[PDB]
Structure formats: C-alpha cells, structure tokens
From a paper:
As a key mitochondrial Ca2+ transporter, NCLX regulates intracellular Ca2+ signalling and vital mitochondrial processes. Here we report the cryogenic electron microscopy (cryo-EM) structures of rat NCLX in cytosol-facing (intermembrane space) and matrix-facing conformations, with and without Ca2+. Each NCLX protomer contains twelve transmembrane helices and two sets of helical hairpins/bundles roughly parallel to the membrane. The structure comprises a transport domain, which mediates NCLX trimer formation at the centre, and a gate domain, located on the periphery without contacting other protomers.
Numbering used by the authors:
A (entry chain B), B (entry chain A), C (entry chain C): 50 to 254, 300 to 582
C-alpha cells in the first residue's frame, strides 16, 4: 500500500510489479498510461529519452489547446452571443471571456476532480495570476506608452483582490464547502451586473470543389508571404487544424454566407456526435451497452447519417437554412470536449513527472501549467499593443484573470462536490511554498494598485521593467527553495 | 511572577486574576488600562470587537497628533523664532524642524522611558527612516520630474548615514550610556552649525461676537466648496480642533493683529495652567497635596483667574499688548503636553496588542508607529510637489529624518538615564528582525547615494518606481518572517 | 596537524609556535609572509593596525595592476598585433581582449594553482560577471541614452550564457578534468572564428637629456592643469610608473619614431632579463646554481651588458633599427611577470584574511577580488560613454567577460593539471553561497536578454536603475547570509 512516490527506491527489476499493482497512481481519466510507459516500456538505460519525449508532447498539447480555443471555440461562442442580440460589453464580459480563458478553466476543472492533483489547480491559478499581472501588463507598457483607462482598471483590480484574499482564506481553513463555491459563482454574477450597470450609466451620462477547399487548412499566398518561422508554426499545426476543420463546425458572424459549407457541415452532422460519445468520460459510457440489443456507437452513427441525408435533401447549396446557429451550438460542444481531452492529458503528464522526480504539485502548477496556459493571451495582447491599441490590451489583461479564478474555482469545486457526493474539497498543504506564491501575488497586486493611479494613469517603460525584474526574482526564489538550497 | 505574555495560556475564567495582580504589564503612565479592558470588561465571546475598537482609537489618536502638531505647535514655534529675529534657514533647521517632527520625537521619548517598550522606539525610528527615503522621496519624483539641489542632498545624506551607523554600533554593543547620548546631541549641534556656515559662505560667494467667531472651528464657504471626502475629514476633526482652539493660544506672525483675540486669550490664560497641571505626569503631581492647607488645582485656578482679570482690565480690545509672545510660549507648552498625552496612549495600545497576540516590539514599531507618525510629512510633501515646488519637498524629505533620529535618541535616552538614576539604557535584542530592518535602511541609503549623482541630479519616474517596489518587497519579507514562514 | 583556521582558538602566547610549524598555511609563492606578520610581529594589542595596513596594501596593489595593464601591457600587445598586420575586429577580440582583461586572468591563474584557494577563483569570476552586467552596463545607460547594436549584443549574450551554464555543470559534478579545460579553450577558438566570419560577411554584404626626459614620469603642464584629486592620484602612482618606465620597454604604433629612446631601451636590454629571472617562480630558479661554476644572475647580467653594448654601437640615436618589435615582445613578457607578482600578493593577502576572520573563499573572491579587478573596466567604459560613444562602451562591456571566464578557467585549470601531474582539479563546495551567486548571475543574464530586445534596443535610464537596485540587494543578501543572520 506504499505511496508510489516510493517507486524510485526499489530495485529496477521490480518497478513493473509496483507500477502495475500499486493503485495509488492510476490516472483518474485519459488514454495513455504515462507511468507504465516511463518505467518499463522503455529500457532503464534511456530514461532521459522518455522524459524529453514527454516534454515535447506537453508542448504540442499546449499548442493544441491554444489553436482549438482561439479559432474554433471562441468564434462559436460569439456566434451564439450575436444570435442572442447582445451588446459589446456584456458579450465581452461573459461569452468572449469564457472563450478567451477556456484552457485555464478546463485545466482547473480536471485538476480539482482528484484529491491527489488538487494542488496543481491552486498552483496554476495563482501562478497564472502572478504571470499575467507582471510580465504581460509590464510588457504592454514597455512596447508602447499610453494613457490607461481609470474606471476599468479600478473596477478590475478591486474585484480581483477580493477574490484572491477569499481564496487565501479558503486555503488557510483547509477546505472548500459548496457554500463557498456558490459564493464564488455569486460574486461572478455580481461582477457582470456591475459592469453592465456602470457602462450603461456612463454611456447615458460543383459541390466537391467547395468541399475540398473547405477541408483545405492552408492558403498558398499567405504561406508564400510569411517568413521561415511562421511557415514552421503553420506546418506544426497543420494536423491539428485538419482534425479540427474536419470534426467541429464553425459559424462566423462577419461573413456574408456565415461559413456555410453545405457538404462539410452536413457531414460533420454525422462526424461530431461520434466524437462526443467517444470523448465523453474517455469512452466508458460510449462502449457501455444498453439492453444488449442496440449498440451505442451504432445507434448514434445511424441516427446521424439519417438526419444528415435528411438535411442534405432539404437544403440547397447556396443559402444557409434558417437555423444554423444550432451548428454554432454543436460546434461549441465538440470544441469543449476536445479541450477537455487535451487538459486531461496535460494533467496526467504533470502528475507522472511529479511522481518520478518527487516534485510538488505547487511548483509544477506554478511554472509549467501556468506558462502553457498563458502563452495564448500573451501573444494576443502583445500583438494588440504593437498594432496601436494598448488601452484594449491592458484592459483585457486584468479583465481575464477575474473570470479565470472565479469561474475556475467555483465550477471545479462544485462539480467535484456533486460527483463525489462529498461535502467539501480538502485543500491539503504542500509545504510552505504555497504561502510564498500567495505573498508574491499579493504584493504584485498592491504595487499595481499604488503605482498606476500615482502616475496619473500614464504608463511607460519604467513600470514594466520593474514588474519584469520582480517576476524573474520570484521564479529564482521558487526554484531555489524547491530544490533545497533555501529550506523553510 | 510569570510574564504576562503568558496570559493567553490560561483558563478564560482566570484571566482577570492574572491581569489584576500580575505587575509585569501594569503600565506606568496614561489614563486608560487597555489590557484589563480587553480581557475581562468585554465578554470573551467578542474579543474581535475590542481589537477593532482599539484600532479605530489608534487611528483617531494619530489624527489628533497630526492636527495638533501642524496647526498649533509649529506656528507657535515660528512665532518664537520670528520674535527672536532669525533668518530663514537657521529657523528651518532648528525650530521648524522641531515642529515638523514632533510626533516621532515624543513617541521615542515615551517609548524609551520603560525597559519593556524600548524596542518600539528603535523599530519606529528605523522604520520611519526606511519609509521616508523610499515611498515619500520616490513619490515626489513620480509626481513631477525636477532637477534636485546638489549641496543640500549631499550634506543631508552624509549626516544621516553617519547617525544611522552610529546607532547600529550602539545596538550591537547592546547599550546606550550617557556619553553616547551627549554625543548624539553634539552631532546635532555640529549639523546646525555646518548648515548655517555653508549657507552663509555660499550666499556671500461687541466682545461676545468675536469670542464666538474665535471659538468657531469651521468656515461656511470653504466647507460648502470642498468635496465629500474633505467634508468627512473636517467633521472627523471638529471635536479635536474645538478642544485645541479652546485650550491652546496661537500667535501667528503673518497676520496684522497676530491672532490677538482679547476674550479668548484672556480666558485661556486661566484654562491652560489647569491643563498643564492635569496632564503633567498624568496628574500625580496635580492631585498631590502640599502642606494639607492649600490644594493644588485650587491655587492654580485662583492665581489664573486673578491674573486673567488683571490683564483683561489693563488692555483694550483692538491692539495687542507689547508682550504676547509670552502667549506664544504658553501655547508651545500646552501643545507639547497634548502631544505627550496622545503619544503615551498610542504606546500603551501598541504594548497591549503585543502582549495579546505575542507580537514583537520591532514589527509593531516598524509598521504601525512608523506609518502613523509619517502620514503628516507624506501629505505635506506630496501637496508641495503637486503645487509646483518639488525641490523644496525633496529637500525637506531628507532634512527631517536627521533631526528625528538624532534628537529622538539623544533626548529620550538622556531623560531616561536622568530619571532612572542609571548609567545606561539596555537595548535587548528582539530576535534577528532588527538586523533585517537595519540592512534595509542601509541599502536604501546606499542606492540613493549612488543613483542621484549618477543621474546628474535629474530625477524622474524610474527612480521613484524602483524605490516603491523595494519598499513593498521589504514589508512582505518582514511579515513573512514575523509570522513564521521564513525563520532565521 | 590542525587546520590553521584553528589558530584563533589558542592562547595568544602560543600563536607563534602554531603559525611557524603548522604547514597548512605556509603559502607556496610570494615574497611576504602575511600571517606570521599579522600574528606575532605586531603585538597582540594592535591587531586592527595590521589589518588596516593590509587593506591599504591591497588597494595599492590593485592600483599597480591597473596601471601596469593599461599603460604598458596592452600597448605592447597592440604593437605586436599591428606588426602582424591584422584588422581591427580580430585584433580587438584577441590581443586587445587579452590586454584589457589581464588582471582577472592572472588572478584566476594564481588562485587555481593551490587546492586551498581555488574557491577564490570561482567566486571572483562569477562576481565580476555579476558586477559588469549590472553596474557597468546599467551605469552606461544612465549616463547617456543610446540605440544599442543588435548583432554584437545577441552574439555576446548567447556565448556568455553557454559558458556560464557549462561552468555550473562543472561545479555540480565537483571537478574539472583536462577534457573540460580543452573544451573551454575550443569554445574560445570557435567564438573568435564566428566574430571574424560574421563581421566579414556583413561587411561584404645630447643623449643624456633625452634619457632624463625618457625616465621622467610626469609632465608639468597637464599636472598644473588638473584638479586636486587628479594630482593626488598622479602622486600616488608616480613610484609605480617610475619602476615601470625604468624596467619595461614600450613600442607604440601611432608615434612617428614609435617611442624609440636609444639610451633607455638599450639599458632596459640589460635591466629586463634580470627582472625576469628574479620574478619567475619568485626567484627559486633564479638563485638555483647550475654546475657550481657560473652563477645565474651573473651570466644573465653579463650577456645582457654584452649585447646592450653591441646594439648601442650598431645603431644611431635618431632612427629605430629594423627589428624593435622584439622590444615589443620583451616588454610583453616583463609586463606579464609584473602582473603575476602583484596577483600572487593579492591572493596571499585574501587567504590570510580568510584564515584570521574565518571567512569563506567565495565571499572574499565575490567582493574584494571582483571589485579590485573591475575598477579599470568601469573607469574606461564610463569615460567612453561620457565622451559620446556609448555604443562602443556597451559592446566592450559584454565582450570582455566572455574572454575573462573562458580563457581564465581554461588556462588556469590546464596549467594546474600540467604542473600537478593530476587528472582533475577538485572544486570543493564552500557551503550554499556559491549557488546564490550562480542564481544571481543567471537571472541578471536572463533579465538583460529579455529586456534589451523588447525595448527595441533603445536603452535609457530605467533599465540601468533597475540593474543597480538589483546589485545592491544581492550584495546585502550575501553579507547577511555570510555573517549568519540568514542561514541556509
């Protein structure tokens, strides 16, 4: 019954027996068993190969998550938002917020679902908070000096500090009960209402050819125009976006036809329910048999092909039907399931690396999960600042993290409480590194709250350079205390 | 004979017996016994109420100190200074310096008078030094870029570093003997002489209506003009300044009549000696009886009313007599006694909070005493910079702390040695937080000494932002080591 | 057989017996025995005098090293470089690099030659790296904003980071074997080749009167023109440069006659071989007798005077002979031997101070050796920036440290391996301060690598102020952990 963190203190011939009958480290969900693979699929000689290969697979999964969220998830959420006839700011605080922060939220939802990994979620949430408010905001001001917006800044910084200190309290007590989770969700509702009300009160005051081009991930002219590095990224993510364009339908509101592609969409109307049944709960309910008479994948593919022929006959190949926002909805679902599968694999990899090297969940979440999840927003915000709109970038910077922390903790803990039939989610402490992380986030927030108003909201290079120096120093201190030079 | 820091390890029914016969924490001065009140006047259920109420009382006492020093003490010192026909710079380095730094000096004088509290004085002096040279000077440069004055800066920084390192030596040896205290006062005399000589060598090279308006603390037009927050502060300090205008006489040199208010002043000529006899040594001498025939408060009120009628008859209600600078002197005395009473109460509150929560004198004096004492200069210096005179603000910033440390340690230790009949004041060490505070002050001074000349005395936003970041980090480290995450 | 760090725990009457028969601290090179002197030449009463005197002697030796390198070593290297008809950039990366970094390299060569002192070399190399990339580069940007050169910066920063991480690996393994040393030298060769190839591909894309004036170290007009401080430095280094001008010949390429001074040079053609034989290995091979018939100093002085008369007769007193670049070579040798003697004395002083005060080699090399060695580079680079060429200063800043670390570790360890007949140089760890130093250098490099490109290579005051603050904080942390307040 030994904890399988004790697998590196065994004779190398008996690590198979341990890994294959110790139940302490069996992935809660997923497809690949990374720890049987790392220990006795590869020969003990070449352990560094297994770990280098796992790190490259982690990086490619982060690319998968970013590409899926930016190009397929968020436009479908926007299609639904426009279909419901909402304004710009309510949309940008609810639907576009969900779309922009998808990777963090799904990562927290997966980590909170298992007692052994719940320390990854806390580390990743606080670490992403520390990273976005120092490196991204600072870099935005270094790239371009601008005059920041007062009211969004003060609103966002105040709400974020309240949410953060509430989470420190929950960490200290050592638990999250469903009253606390419902409190997180209630605070989010109050934030959306205050944004709406403040912005209102201040405003008043041949088929086959089009199928082949539809499935074609790449355009000749742009690819011939970009540099070498952009070509390299495009060829890196070509398989990802081929599977995406093949299996998720995207409704786009700016277009005249609204990306209506009659053969492609009427074929995904068969392809996508199969992806749902195979991906939901990693397939257990997919292969489950009802009654022993009608198999499950068979019935879903049969009904899918029936209704795909039904819609193919009923529509012509020029003008969309009157109800393809349901294509928007169906695309939302299967984009969400793709993100869920990628996040489950990422969390399993990080857990296995923690078992092998006897690392802590806090440092793994603090560094690798946080950076991998924040690469997307960093890229988006820096591009927006360089184009000539740094007010928008600095606003979105502080606007995203509130949604992330609040919805992530709320939903993740609530769903764990519901499926587990428990009354609380225990937050066991991983040493005293969690309090170093907490104090780093706290002081960062305090520095921004004092500095930006005192500059009269005129931000420049000095502010960003100070924040960048602070982040480098914090990371060095974390690494030095994790590996045992400075012990607390 | 147990130390009453051991009162929180007793059965809650026996905390009365301890607090009322343990002599370890029977404070030797003041009016209110905060520790009997916190333990068994309030029911043990609602201890947080007692402490919230004590924190609000601390804040109001800091407001009392600031209002009394700025409006009543310093103008009387200036009235005496002008009456003696002094120049601007000698006055600004002696009399106006005393007036501007009153709260720090009286706080140190009170803390040094008791072996159990002498750690508050060291913490407060070093902490105010760290705060003024990072947050106030930095904020001055952030608000407005300017070209600093070379000679005042170099003079002040050199003198301050000598005084600070001398105090580190005294701390290391663990004592202050009266030779050291007289040395502090001698260094102050040398500093004043060098300022005089350098500035010279570089320059050469119905009655009732006026009584009611005299007692009226508030003016209609200004109050109607200010915002909500200023109205709130005015109504907060109306009782304070009513008692002040009632009991301390102010002679003002710019006015044509020199705030001569015949009925008000000839009535304070009775009111003020009573305040002196009731406030001196918290009243022990006041109620003491001489000979058993003539009571003390009676004789002072009798002589006061006699001489008040005598001066009322002898003067007319338009032109001051030829000797009301004696009103300036009498106002100086009773302003000083008000400040002494407020500082005694503040020190007793901090000591009680240290006993209850088992905190150290160093951290309490490092933060609460230092911030409460420095709010005044912060406000004055930031207003001066925003008005368009940041050279003056940056000069006064480094000019005040020399007076504070030098006169505070000198006088406080000298008076304790005199009343105690001892030969030294023992400086017992409160752990290794005092050396963290010492090194923070040292590095702050070294950074300013290198940076300002290297910029060619052209100061801007980057300097101040670096200093602000350093102060936030230092406070976080102090809090983290006090509460036990990082132990030394 | 006790370690003589245990000499301060003995009765003061028996410290002579220990110091004169303990072989643990009998230094194996140099002229003065600093530890016999500090313990029982001076009376035990006045130990502070011995140490103050030793600190002044250390400072004067650092001045000796700087004056010898800048005025006598480097011009001779340049004379050889021009004589071989090289271009500007190859010369500036090989010969002028050697000349500019002489003190660091000779210091490392001396420290690595003894197991007891090899910790001084690591500390000094890493500490000089930390100092040059924070204080010198930062000060250059504070003095003058400029647009930095991209390609030199990126080349230099990349090569330096590779060299530094390679040395951390060698430190972790605990050894340097001659394969590693040859690897250091091979990396240096690759760096020189890449600089050459990149710059090429981007470019294509009465006798007695002249003798007395020759020996005259001082000029009247300049000395009458400078200030008091410059006069003080000139009189401080007059004896140094008198011995230098007397015993080392300098060939200078800009001059019309090329500093050809017929009597002075034909006399140094006797004087200099004597200095070589007396300075090489501190004189052991000098006084060694061959055969017992011809003494060594006698034969060298005899042959020297013979060939000096021979060259005096053969040449006239106006035009140089056709081969005085051999004077350049002979001057190179004896300048190198002067630098070697001064560096040996400096290392012996630091070792004795470590034994007396029980300090570590890491902190001694981190601060005193690093600062003393880098004063020259800082003076040269700050003067160059103030004159109006800050691109050149910022280039030389990062270009010097690569040569320093790479050639210093390579040659020092290689020569120790060769003379010792061993297979490796053991790098024993002095606690956990070496890892604090390593992490400081690492983060500094990372900050510069991120910040400078992000600013678009437009450098100003904010960058330098951040770097200066970081260096002050790092030094305070080092001092606080060495003296035991913060223990790791």
């Amino acid at each position: 019954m030994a904890d399988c963190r004790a697998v590196c203190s065994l004779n190398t011939s008996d690590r198979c027996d341990f890994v294959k009958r110790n139940p302490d480290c069996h992935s809660e969900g997923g497809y690949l068993d990374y720890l049987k693979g790392i220990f006795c699929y590869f020969p003990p000689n070449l352990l560094p190969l297994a770990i280098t290969l796992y790190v490259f697979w982690l990086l490619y999964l982060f690319l998968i998550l970013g590409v899926t969220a930016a190009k397929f998830f968020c436009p479908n959420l926007s299609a639904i938002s426009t279909s419901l006839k909402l304004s710009h700011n309510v949309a940008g605080v609810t639907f576009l917020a969900f779309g922009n922060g998808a990777p963090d939220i799904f990562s927290a939802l997966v980590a909170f679902s298992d007692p052994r990994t719940a320390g990854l979620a806390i580390g990743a949430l606080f670490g992403a908070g520390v990273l976005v408010t120092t490196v991204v905001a600072g870099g935005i001001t270094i790239l371009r000096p601008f005059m920041a917006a007062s009211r969004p800044f003060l609103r966002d910084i105040t709400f974020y500090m309240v949410a953060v200190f509430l989470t420190f309290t929950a960490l200290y007590l050592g638990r999250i009960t469903l009253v606390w989770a419902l409190g997180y969700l209630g605070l989010y509702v109050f934030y959306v209402v205050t944004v709406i009300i403040c912005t209102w009160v201040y405003q008043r005051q041949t088929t086959g050819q089009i199928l082949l081009q539809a499935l074609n991930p790449l355009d000749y002219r742009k690819w011939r125009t970009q540099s070498i590095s952009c070509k390299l990224l495009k060829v890196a993510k070509l398989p990802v976006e081929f599977l995406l364009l093949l299996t998720v339908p995207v409704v786009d509101p700016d277009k005249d036809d609204r990306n209506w592609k009659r053969p492609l969409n009427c074929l995904q109307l068969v392809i996508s329910p199969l992806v749902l049944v195979l991906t939901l709960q990693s397939g257990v309910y997919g292969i489950y048999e009802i009654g022993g008479l009608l198999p499950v994948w068979a019935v879903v593919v049969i009904v899918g092909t029936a209704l795909a022929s039904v819609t193919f006959f009923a529509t012509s190949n020029s003008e969309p039907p009157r109800l393809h926002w349901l294509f928007a909805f169906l695309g939302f679902l299967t984009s969400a399931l793709w993100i869920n599968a990628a996040a489950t694999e990422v969390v399993n990899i990080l857990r296995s690396l923690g078992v092998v090297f006897r690392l802590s969940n806090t440092v793994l979440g603090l560094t690798l999960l946080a950076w991998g999840n924040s690469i997307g927003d960093a890229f988006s915000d820096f591009t927006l600042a360089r184009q000539g709109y740094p007010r928008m970038a600095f606003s979105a910077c502080f606007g995203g993290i509130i949604f992330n922390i609040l919805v992530g903790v709320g939903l993740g803990c609530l769903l764990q409480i519901v499926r587990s039939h428990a009354s609380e989610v225990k937050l066991e402490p991983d040493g005293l590194l969690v309090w170093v992380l907490a104090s780093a986030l706290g002081l960062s927030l305090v520095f921004s709250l004092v500095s930006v108003p005192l500059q009269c909201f005129q931000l420049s290079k000095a502010y960003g350079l100070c924040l960048l120096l602070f982040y480098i120093c914090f990371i060095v201190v974390v690494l030095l205390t994790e590996f045992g030079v400075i012990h607390l």
